[PDB]
């Protein structure tokens, strides 16, 4: 019968919870209770990119910290020059409902995807000189909510059918499929060394996957609602999760337990994007209150606010070298802050 | 030196010209999110006006030289609270319902679906066009005796046909009393906690009706006019 297996699983969960509690010798707040604060941090909008008609869900920086691709819900990708506010490329999409975009580490390719369940890859360095779909990756049974390049040829896509997949471009067929999430996966963050990654889903639980191994490794919980954003710490031994309960949390892989909770009674609307600074000392987080926020990852006190968006903040991205922070919003504007 | 940056400036100018053309063609079209259930009959609605894995379908139709751009969602999972936020910029949300769904009931599940759409955070401004489909099959279901609408909804016994009713000639009074009870169930939710930012436009449509192209236009026209008058504080 399934009942006895249910009690066995419940006992296993209780044992794991007891072990995690035993491993909690002390709280991170006590250790950092006498650390040096950073003080209030203020930022000013250096650039404001315009040209997108409808809202913006996706925005990805390049590896040179100079070009960023931005996707708009009218069916348009635009590659900007953050230095000169110059539109390098403007690529129309076959599907006008795009929920994500990416940027190859080599800078040769971009990707899109969304409500049509298809991830289309565009090569920007064609011999002719135009932009055309190198290929599309059909096979998912739910809206593709995120996709991040591992290299020029491996791309991992998380879909709304509760399963992530790893595809090889040349083959065009699913190399691997990671299943186990009960709710649809919202955002996956690749490791700094791109050997592991983390997938947060709508079941209020995140998972760690080994892309080479092909199965889950660790499971992290604590959130009370949908996980909207995942981001790895710069050194790759931690990640921050932002959810709909308007709280952020920091999880350490080796400790396999929550460390610090960034929350405030004033905050009511949930987080929609998170990102970390290049040194990991500064955690940026967009919200539904139409403005971003800045936290210190250790002291866990707000050290800045990025107001200036008159609609929902959907995408937030810090450069690889951590100079500028771009924020796109549902008002069809991107703002670079420095 | 200046030749390079001039070349990128020329590229930006041509790209911006293309974006202005795309804005001109995009701002002139009306995007409709067609909703409903598997048994409602939106498939026949799409097929009838189709006279001009994949996670979304597409049908383009023109009414009086106006571009309408209807999105039928298919091949998706049951949960719809995370991709429904993509449709917070559409002109209207068509919500087709099978009127004869009762006799389990399955008509209360349509009210709860319309209840959740109405009060969603991002759909507070999107007006809903309501189509009461299967208006033919409802006629025989109530004109059979083995319907008993009162058990599913107790209030049908105490409900009287409204004064502003305009029944079609030759319709049985018992048919029309049942017909207008269902409509007033959806208009109970719409008029409760909706302010004036969005409205509902019920229609007693059918699968063999050619006016559905006109009914969507005549109500999208009403929605845009009400939007302009709000910016001028004329309403």
């Amino acid at each position, epitope marked *: 019968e399934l009942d006895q297996l249910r009690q066995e699983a419940e006992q296993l969960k209780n044992q794991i919870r007891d072990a995690r509690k035993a491993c909690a010798d002390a709280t991170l707040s006590q250790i950092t209770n006498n650390i040096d604060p950073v003080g209030r941090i203020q930022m000013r909008t250096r650039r404001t990119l315009r040209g997108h008609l409808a809202k913006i869900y996706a925005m990805h920086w390049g590896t040179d910290s100079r070009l960023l691709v931005s996707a708009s819900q009218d069916g348009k990708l635009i590659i900007w020059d953050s230095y000169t506010t110059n539109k390098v490329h403007a690529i129309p999409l076959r599907s006008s409902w795009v929920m994500t975009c990416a940027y190859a580490p080599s800078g040769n390719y971009v990707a899109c995807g969304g409500l049509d369940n298809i991830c289309s890859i565009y090569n920007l360095k064609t011999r002719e000189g135009n932009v055309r779909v190198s290929r599309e990756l059909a096979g998912h049974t739910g809206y593709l909510s995120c996709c991040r390049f591992l290299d020029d040829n491996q791309i991992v896509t998380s879909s709304g059918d509760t399963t992530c997949a790893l595809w090889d471009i040349e083959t065009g067929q699913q190399t691997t499929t990671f299943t186990g999430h*009960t709710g649809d996966v919202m955002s996956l963050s690749l490791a700094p060394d791109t050997r592991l990654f983390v997938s947060g889903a709508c079941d209020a639980s995140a998972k760690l996957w080994d892309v080479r191994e092909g199965m889950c490794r660790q499971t992290f919980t604590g959130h*009370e609602s*949908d996980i909207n954003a995942i981001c790895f710490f710069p050194n790759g031994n931690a990640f921050a999760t932002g959810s*709909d309960d308007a709280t952020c949390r920091l999880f350490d892989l080796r400790a396999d337990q929550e460390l610090m909770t960034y929350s405030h009674d004033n905050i009511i609307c949930g987080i929609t994007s998170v990102s970390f600074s290049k040194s990991g000392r500064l955690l940026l987080a967009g919200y539904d209150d139409f403005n971003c926020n800045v936290w210190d990852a250790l002291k866990a006190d707000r050290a800045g606010v990025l107001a200036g968006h008159d609609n929902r903040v959907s995408c937030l991205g810090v450069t690889d070298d951590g100079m500028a922070v771009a924020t796109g919003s549902w008002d069809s504007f991107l703002k670079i802050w420095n | 030196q200046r030749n390079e940056e001039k070349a990128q400036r020329e590229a930006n100018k041509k790209i911006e010209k293309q974006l202005q053309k795309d804005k001109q063609v995009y701002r002139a079209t009306h995007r409709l999110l067609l909703l409903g259930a598997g048994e409602s009959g939106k498939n026949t609605i799409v097929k009838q006006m189709r006279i001009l894995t994949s996670g979304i379908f597409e049908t383009k139709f023109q009414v009086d030289k106006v571009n309408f751009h209807m999105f039928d969602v298919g091949a998706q999972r049951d949960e*719809r609270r995370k991709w429904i936020q993509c449709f917070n910029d559409v002109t209207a949300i068509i919500f087709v319902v099978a009127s004869s769904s009762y006799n*389990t009931n399955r008509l209360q599940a349509a009210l709860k679906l319309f209840d959740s759409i109405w009060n969603n955070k991002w759909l507070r401004d999107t007006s809903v066009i309501l189509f009461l489909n299967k208006q033919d099959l409802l006629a025989e279901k109530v004109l059979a005796g083995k319907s008993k609408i009162e058990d599913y909804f*107790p209030e049908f016994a105490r409900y009287t046909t409204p004064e502003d009713a305009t029944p079609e000639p030759g319709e049985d009074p018992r048919v029309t009393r049942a017909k207008y009870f269902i409509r007033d169930e959806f208009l109970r939710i719409s008029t409760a906690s909706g302010d004036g930012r969005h409205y509902c436009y019920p229609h007693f449509t059918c699968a063999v009706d050619t006016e559905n192209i006109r009914r969507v236009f005549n109500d999208c026209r009403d929605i845009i006019q009400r939007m302009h008058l709000r910016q001028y504080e004329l309403l």
Partner: nanobody
Framework: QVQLQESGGGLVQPGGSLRLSCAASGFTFSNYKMNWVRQAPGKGLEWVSD????????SYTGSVKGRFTISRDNAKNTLYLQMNSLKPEDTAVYYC?????????????????????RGQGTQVTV
């Protein structure tokens, strides 16, 4: 981890009364509206009753009007369902369902067949 556990169901003669309790752990009880959804044999999930954050707004389905009643103890973070004048058609599995996000008037896909914030269920036969 969010956990919901319902109890108090079982076989009963028609016309009796039931007291089903829903214990919730892992989240602030007050912020979320909560639902009671039943599934009859051979049929899909069906929504029965709902109570809001403060407990002021209570709504029922047509088939349970004037018979069932619900309440929420935020201090004891539990949900209640009380039955009156049972019928043979009420034999079903009852699931105490939650709301995906706090501070919202109503929320989607509670009655879905793959929802996450619902309990194992109580089988009630008449």
């Amino acid at each position: 981890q969010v956990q919901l556990q319902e109890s108090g169901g079982g076989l009963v003669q028609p016309g009796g009364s039931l007291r089903l309790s829903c214990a919730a752990s892992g989240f602030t009880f007050s912020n979320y509206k909560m639902n009671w959804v039943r599934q009859a044999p051979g049929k899909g999930l069906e929504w029965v009753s709902d109570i809001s954050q403060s407990g002021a707004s209570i709504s029922y389905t047509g088939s349970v009007k004037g018979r069932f009643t619900i309440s929420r103890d935020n201090a004891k973070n539990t949900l209640y369902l009380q039955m009156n004048s049972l019928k043979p058609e009420d034999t079903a599995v009852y699931y105490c369902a939650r709301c995906p996000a706090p501070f919202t008037r109503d929320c989607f896909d509670v009655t879905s067949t793959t929802y996450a914030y619902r309990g194992q269920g109580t089988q009630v036969t008449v």
